């Protein structure tokens, strides 16, 4: 087992534990280049061109120069490598921000807590973590500021839980709180290994020759933050990648996108044309070599065999046509997708100001699935909600009270029952006036907000109070309650106070007994003692448990408050009943023994204390009910309505319990009223089997409409999810899920948030997005196609390994609709163009071999064909790729139905790819056949009777085939900025200036030996300028008219938008939502006793004795 020596800086490095160095970059520096070759060979084009340049090196076979296709491979090799180094730097310094963060660390030489970063935290050091500070690594607390050495961690990164957990240090080491008396630590730490089991831990720590057992109670984890405690004293156990949280999540894998999976089925459709066009031509060379052996005597042919000159001309036609595959495709698809990921991460409407965090695209290859999203797998806490509860309204005696009144809701006439709203100061007027009937009820209500809970207050340096709550719901009951009067202040071990601020006096309240919240109890009760001596019972809990404990003849407001609790949860608020009873002095005396007889016992205490409460809460009367609301993040209910108009199906996968993910779903308008649920939360696999079988059977028997498909939703939980993710019922789980609108899954483990993603990925063909924060769903980001992170102020281990990191949820509308459906059209033209520019030119080699007796003479010079991909026609893939908006940003967000173009893939398929290849043939059989009817014998020129050779004709084919391919790009583009005039009609002016410089200067230096005088015999000739005028126009009349006929007489759905731009089973009705965020092990009943806040702070920091 792993052993740790406490108070040792040297010997703990001997065991070879890891360091705090995390790596988010897809490789390191040392494994750069041999990992890089698998990255270059997984593209089928770059795999093909290495073999071709090896084929060129057998002698006397190359029609071109011997080094041209290794000369344009090393450029493709280098530019795709210089992209990779700057995607290493950008993911080095963004990793450096976690490495550089601070931590107080014990150093025995200084004997003081010194300032060092997170990196040098060896396993075995002693650290100190202040308030609201993330824990750097998985540690074991020794002692702390709180009485009995406890603390509170917020596990919002470890799971979806909103409440705080108590982690009490062991009582033996409670005394070692002194940084001066820390220096006597002697012993070992016998622990377990890295286990990746979050809620289980074992270990035995020995100190001063005395063992101490450990527990998961005495352990806090890496992603959790320390809250509501001054400091803790930690001894680090795991670190780096061997933590309990970050071991299963690997590095960023190579995620092959959904466009590159169509390219590698397009290139296979181009090796067919390449193999056919060898076995059409090279078969013909066999025929003409033997059939015209009489008439080819001037060539001195060998004629040795029919299989030697076949293979001596199988490679010539292999080399001449090997530029049919474009080698500049797999670089200008990287350098568009890199320059699009720089344009996404610079938009002000994707920039969160309050944190000052711009969006950043780490993995820049996954930019074009943002237009093909069909499922979204969100997260509830951190992503949807803001993790902040505030008290909204309260209802007592059939009257509702809210601070701001909505304009649709008002206290109207009763229809037999009074509904509506009132302001909060009107509740004070019924409270202050001693004539009204409800004034004893309001006073019994507004102290119940202030006394019954377990919050512990702490004064600030300012006189303003800050409430430290175990559960964040009742932390909003007090703070919202103190706005109404009755502010809660100082707590004592026997009693609490409350300061009535309008009278200034403080009334004591002797806390006699208090019960704790549980899962199945769904209530908690606190028996108090008033300052009058008349003791009292209070209670708060759920509707289905409080309704079975009444005194029915006493209370008459019961029907009036249940109508309000159908009203509250309909708006999406977390409700809570508030009921009391009066208890005499003798009836306490009979029961408080029986509670204590359940207290002296040891082993049945967990099942007898809840029994001990049931004997006393029998006859209750009803005050009313309150409704805390959860703050959804900004723009969340407006986003999800837009994302469901575009056909995307939102799936929520929380880690929270089931009773509050439904309530969040009601407030974000995922759910709605008049929408019955399909709840599957069953124990054993057979009980999921029947309830899976019943839901599918109840709705496949009859056709239900799309209006009736929106009226259904699914809710499942993680205990029931592992039995529907076994491979025998996965098909059933789709068939219920493929009909409902929204799907909520609850209490879902960190593994099962990937096993749902890895199930829909291999069951349908639809892409799917995953969005979240924290490291409980870092496994979900590595399983989905696009994984969006949300960078929070704490944690953000999701935003490390995510492909896109965003500020909050409301930027997902502009990302997926504007920047997603642009980045799918903007690459599905600059790829279909880059497959077309290398076929309108390099087919005139093939239409040449019907002349020249099936030999393979290249129609143009060797270098001028290698300048075609690199110089003159590399710019119109860029300007189409990054600067072309087919519908603007106002119009895509205005009409969200336009996203159904990118879902079905109506822009990029093989049935539309072949429309650009065949258009690349017909554009090459006009620049050829139009230039053999001209230059019919070479007799074209008027220069004193000279003629045009082989090289003053090949330029007329090349210069015409550039001014077609540029002229086609001026018809497929949509928007002419100042950067389009530089590329598309400017690269023509590049070639008509670079060529006379290339024809006078470079031949003198023994390179490109031919066209030694062609610039005289082309540019001065009157035929070369009348060929460039009409031979484009003859081959673009097909394009200029079918583009016109498509806009008017058969228009698609987005063309009218482009024309618009230039000119213009439980049912929810009777469900009263209960959501109390407290869970077991919040340390509910131990924590009320050992506190004070009138006692001043201790000497060494915030040491406070247990005053119980």
């Amino acid at each position: 087992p792993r052993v740790i020596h406490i108070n040792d800086s040297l010997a703990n490095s001997s065991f070879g534990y890891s360091d705090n160095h995390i790596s988010t970059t897809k490789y390191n520096f040392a494994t750069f280049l041999p990992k890089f070759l698998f990255q270059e060979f997984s593209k089928y084009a770059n795999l093909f061109f290495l073999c071709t340049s090896a084929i060129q090196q057998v002698p006397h076979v190359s029609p071109t120069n011997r080094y041209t296709t290794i000369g344009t491979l090393l450029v493709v090799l280098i530019v795709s490598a210089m992209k990779e180094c700057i995607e290493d730097i950008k993911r080095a310094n963004s990793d450096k921000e976690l490495n550089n963060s601070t931590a107080e660390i014990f150093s025995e030489a200084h004997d003081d807590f010194v300032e060092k970063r997170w990196i040098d935290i060896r396993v075995g050091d002693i650290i100190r973590v202040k308030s609201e500070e993330p824990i750097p690594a998985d540690t074991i607390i020794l002692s702390s500021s709180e009485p009995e050495g406890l603390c509170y961690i917020e596990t919002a990164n470890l799971d979806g839980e909103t409440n705080l957990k108590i982690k009490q240090s062991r009582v033996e080491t409670a005394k070692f709180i002194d940084v001066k008396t820390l220096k006597n630590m002697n012993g070992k730490v016998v622990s377990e290994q890295p286990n990746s089991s979050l809620y289980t831990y074992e270990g035995t720590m020995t100190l001063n020759d005395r063992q101490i057992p450990l527990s998961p109670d005495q352990m806090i984890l890496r992603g959790a933050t320390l809250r509501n405690t001054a400091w803790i004293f930690g001894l680090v156990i795991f670190t780096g990648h061997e933590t309990k949280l970050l071991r299963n999540a690997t590095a960023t894998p190579i995620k092959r996108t959904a466009v590159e999976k169509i390219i590698n089925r397009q290139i296979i459709a181009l090796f067919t044309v390449l193999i056919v066009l060898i076995l059409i031509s090279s078969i013909g060379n066999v025929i003409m070599s033997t059939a015209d052996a009489k008439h080819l005597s001037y060539l001195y042919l060998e004629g040795t065999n029919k299989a030697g000159l076949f293979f001596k001309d199988f490679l010539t036609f292999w080399i001449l046509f090997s530029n049919l595959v474009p080698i500049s495709l797999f670089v200008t698809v990287e350098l568009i997708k890199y320059y699009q990921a720089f344009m996404i991460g610079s938009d002000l409407d994707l920039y969160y100001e309050k944190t000052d965090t711009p969006t950043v695209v780490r993995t820049s290859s996954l930019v074009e699935e943002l237009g093909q999203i069909e499922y979204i797998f969100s997260d509830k806490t951190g992503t949807l909600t803001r993790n902040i509860m505030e008290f909204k309204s309260c209802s007592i005696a059939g009257h509702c009270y809210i601070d701001k009144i909505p304009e649709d809701k008002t206290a109207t006439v009763e229809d037999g029952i009074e509904v509506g709203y009132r302001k909060f100061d009107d509740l004070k007027k019924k409270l202050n006036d001693p004539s009204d009937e409800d004034s004893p009820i309001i006073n019994d209500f507004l102290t119940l907000l202030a006394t019954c809970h377990t919050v512990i207050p702490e004064f600030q340096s300012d006189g303003s109070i800050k409430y430290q709550a175990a559960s964040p719901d009742e932390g909003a009951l007090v703070q919202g309650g103190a706005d109404l009067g009755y502010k809660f202040i100082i707590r004592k071990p026997n009693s609490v106070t409350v300061l009535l601020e309008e009278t200034g006096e403080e009334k004591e309240y002797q806390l006699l007994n208090i019960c704790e919240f549980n899962s199945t109890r769904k209530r908690m009760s606190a028996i108090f003692r008033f300052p009058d001596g008349s003791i009292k019972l209070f209670c708060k809990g759920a509707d289905t448990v409080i309704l079975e404990r009444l005194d029915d003849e006493a209370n008459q407001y019961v029907e009036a408050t249940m109508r309000h609790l159908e009203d509250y949860a309909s708006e999406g608020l977390r409700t809570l009943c508030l009921a009391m009873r009066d208890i005499s002095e003798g009836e306490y005396e009979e029961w408080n023994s029986i509670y204590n007889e359940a207290a002296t016992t040891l082993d049945n205490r967990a099942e007898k204390l809840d029994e001990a409460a049931n004997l006393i809460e029998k006859n209750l009367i009803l005050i009313g009910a309150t409704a805390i609301e959860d703050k959804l993040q900004d723009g969340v209910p407006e986003t999800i309505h837009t994302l469901q108009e575009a056909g995307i199906k939102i799936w929520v996968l929380t880690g929270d319990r089931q009773e509050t993910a439904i309530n969040i779903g009601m407030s974000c308008r995922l759910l709605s009223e008049d929408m019955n649920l399909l709840i599957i939360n069953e124990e054993t696999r057979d009980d999921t089997e029947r309830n899976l079988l019943e839901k599918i059977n109840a709705l496949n028997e009859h056709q239900l409409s799309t209006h009736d498909m929106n009226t259904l939703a699914l809710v499942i939980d993680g205990k029931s999810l592992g039995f529907a993710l076994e491979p025998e019922l996965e098909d059933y789980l789709l068939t219920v899920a493929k009909l409902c609108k929204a799907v909520i899954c609850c209490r879902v483990s960190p593994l099962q948030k990937a096993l749902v993603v890895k199930m829909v990925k291999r069951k349908s063909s639809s892409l799917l997005l995953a969005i979240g924060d924290g490291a409980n769903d870092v496994s979900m980001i590595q399983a989905a196609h696009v994984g969006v992170g949300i960078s929070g102020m704490e944690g953000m281990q999701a935003a490390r390994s995510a492909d896109i990191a965003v500020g909050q949820f409301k930027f997902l509308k502009k990302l997926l609709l504007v920047h997603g459906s642009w980045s799918y059209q903007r690459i599905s033209v600059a790829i279909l163009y880059s497959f077309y520019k290398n076929t309108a030119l390099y087919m005139t080699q093939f239409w040449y071999v019907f002349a020249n007796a099936f030999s393979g003479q290249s129609i143009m010079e060797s270098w001028t064909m290698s300048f075609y991909n690199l110089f003159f026609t590399v710019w119109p893939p860029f300007v189409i790729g990054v600067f072309d908006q087919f519908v603007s940003s106002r119009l895509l967000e205005r009409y969200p139905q336009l996203y159904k173009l990118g879902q079905k893939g109506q822009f990029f398929s093989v049935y539309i790819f072949w429309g650009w290849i065949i258009n690349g043939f017909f554009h090459s059989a006009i620049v050829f056949i139009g230039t053999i009817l001209i230059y019919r014998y070479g007799f074209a020129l008027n220069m004193h009777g000279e003629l045009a050779d082989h090289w003053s004709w090949g330029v007329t084919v090349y210069t015409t085939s550039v001014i077609i391919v540029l002229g086609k790009a001026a018809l497929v583009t949509n928007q002419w900025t100042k950067f389009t005039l530089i590329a598309i009609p400017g690269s023509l002016l590049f070639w008509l200036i670079f060529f006379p410089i290339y024809a006078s200067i470079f031949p003198h230096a023994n390179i490109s030996r031919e066209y030694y005088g062609v610039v005289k015999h082309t540019y001065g000739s009157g035929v070369f300028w009348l060929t460039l005028i009409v031979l484009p126009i003859f081959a673009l009349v097909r394009d200029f008219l079918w583009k016109y006929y498509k806009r008017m007489y058969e228009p698609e759905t987005y063309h009218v938008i482009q024309e618009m731009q230039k000119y213009n089973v439980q049912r929810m009705k009777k469900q009263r939502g209960f959501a109390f965020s407290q869970a077991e092990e919040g340390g509910q009943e131990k924590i009320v006793r050992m506190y004070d806040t009138t006692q001043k702070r201790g000497k060494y920091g915030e040491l406070q004795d247990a005053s119980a």
Partner: protein
């Protein structure tokens, strides 16, 4: 501090313009390219029919000619175009010299004077000049005059670089297969028509003359190529080594054309105009036809503004101006009859 700027380029709100394909825009562009192309598409046919040529196929002259007197060429061997009509078909006869070398005299009548300059080309058909084993197969250095030794020769002239450990001087399949057929320098005028002197000066490219220099070889190391043995039977002497700087008809052979049918320039006359009458041409039949299996010919075209009788540039300006004026009326039919 990480806030990206508000420049009008970075937010992709650049000042932009859109193409509105609308029938008040595209339709006055179909009349922009059907009223500037037709006055060119007619202006080129009028300058490709003002070219007057005369094509004589002298290919089978050794077989089908009498040595005695003239006859008519069959119609399937003559194409000719002029302003006026001819009065007699051209005439032709074979003449075997005393040594045993043939000669094919040709007599034709030219129906009117031609004021422009006069060019004489010879048309060769089915001769694959653009074969891959043929274009690159000549040495660059030996044309310039550098005395290259055997080991540093080009490998492109691969079958004929050496015969008996000797430097085949203009190596390469181009210079080995040169057209031998000399053309008589004067159209000798018969029946008291005045004879017409043509010259062969400046028939090559003007940049080939700077590149074609005389050789610095010693004459003891260089043999003729194996198809030049009927002119230099002993070998290359020291006195009549060929000066390729002034050998014009060798320069227009190494400028390799691009199709199996091509013209090659061999004679021209600029300073004057030939008058009407009947003339005579003399051609020696040295180059056989079974070497390539085609048809050598003889043309007398005049150089026009776009070349000879080449209607293809005038027609390609009219199929555009046809389709850009046909669909300029299917606009106004499909608009009005069916909006």
């Amino acid at each position: 501090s990480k806030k990206p700027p508000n420049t009008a380029f970075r937010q992709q709100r650049l000042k932009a313009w859109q193409p509105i394909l609308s029938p008040q825009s595209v339709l006055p562009l179909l009349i922009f390219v059907a009223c500037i192309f037709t006055p060119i598409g007619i202006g080129l046919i009028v300058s490709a029919t003002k070219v007057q040529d005369l094509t004589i196929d002298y290919s089978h002259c050794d077989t089908k000619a009498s040595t005695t007197a003239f006859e008519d060429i069959p119609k399937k061997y003559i194409k000719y175009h002029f302003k006026s009509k001819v009065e007699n078909k051209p005439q032709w006869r074979l003449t075997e010299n005393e040594n045993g070398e043939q000669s094919c005299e040709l007599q034709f009548e030219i129906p009117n004077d031609i004021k422009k300059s006069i060019f004489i080309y010879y048309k060769i058909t089915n001769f694959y000049q653009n074969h891959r084993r043929y274009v690159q197969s000549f040495d660059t250095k030996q044309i310039l005059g550098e005395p290259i030794k055997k080991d540093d020769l080009d490998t492109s002239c691969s079958p004929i670089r050496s015969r008996e450990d000797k430097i085949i001087y203009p190596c390469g399949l181009i210079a080995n297969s040169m057209f031998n057929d000399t053309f008589s320098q004067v159209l000798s005028g018969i029946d008291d028509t005045e004879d017409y002197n043509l010259t062969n000066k400046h028939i090559s490219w003007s940049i080939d003359r700077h590149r074609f220099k005389t050789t610095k070889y010693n004459a003891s190391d260089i043999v003729p190529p194996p198809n030049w043995m009927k002119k230099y039977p002993d070998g290359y002497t020291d006195e009549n080594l060929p000066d390729i700087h002034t050998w014009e008809e060798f320069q227009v052979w190494m400028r390799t054309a691009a199709f199996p049918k091509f013209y090659k320039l061999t004679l021209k006359n600029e300073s004057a105009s030939l008058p009407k009458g009947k003339y005579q041409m003399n051609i020696e039949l040295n180059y056989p036809i079974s070497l390539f299996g085609g048809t050598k010919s003889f043309v007398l075209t005049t150089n026009g503004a776009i070349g000879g009788r080449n209607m293809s540039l005038g027609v390609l300006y009219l199929i555009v101006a046809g389709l850009c004026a046909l669909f300029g009326i299917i606009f106004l039919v499909k608009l009005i009859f069916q909006p």
